[PDB]
């Protein structure tokens, strides 16, 4: 574990078909089918080319509480992180952060979605 947490996120996180991810257009109840298909507890909005325009975690649809577009209530933009860092890096951001997920990104461009529950 140890060793674990000297990996690089790179190779720990969710890529290709487990990335969560729709288009800014989506209804959020489409979204949320997004989520509940691909286990992370969040979604990527995102472009067909994988460009990052937002993200929308399960917290995030409590805090819409107080029928939409995922645009109309996702967090635009959001927090993410480089695929080099290290896995004890990651873990320590999202701690601080009290997040349980990040995305990893090149800039705005999607790489990949990061669990803590991966960093086992």
Request: charged share 25%; hydrophobic share 45%.
């Amino acid at each position: 574990l140890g060793r674990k947490l000297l990996l690089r996120v790179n190779d720990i996180m969710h890529t290709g078909d487990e990335i969560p991810h729709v288009k800014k257009t989506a209804s959020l109840r489409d979204a949320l089918l997004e989520v509940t298909r691909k286990n992370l507890g969040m979604t990527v909005i995102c472009d067909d080319n994988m460009m990052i325009e937002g993200i929308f975690t399960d917290g995030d649809l409590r805090r819409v509480f107080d029928r939409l577009s995922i645009a109309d209530v996702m967090t635009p933009g959001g927090i993410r992180v480089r695929p080099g860092i290290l896995a004890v890096e990651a873990l320590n951001l999202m701690q601080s952060r009290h997040i349980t997920s990040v995305m990893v990104a090149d800039g705005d461009h999607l790489l990949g979605v990061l669990h803590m529950h991966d960093l086992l």
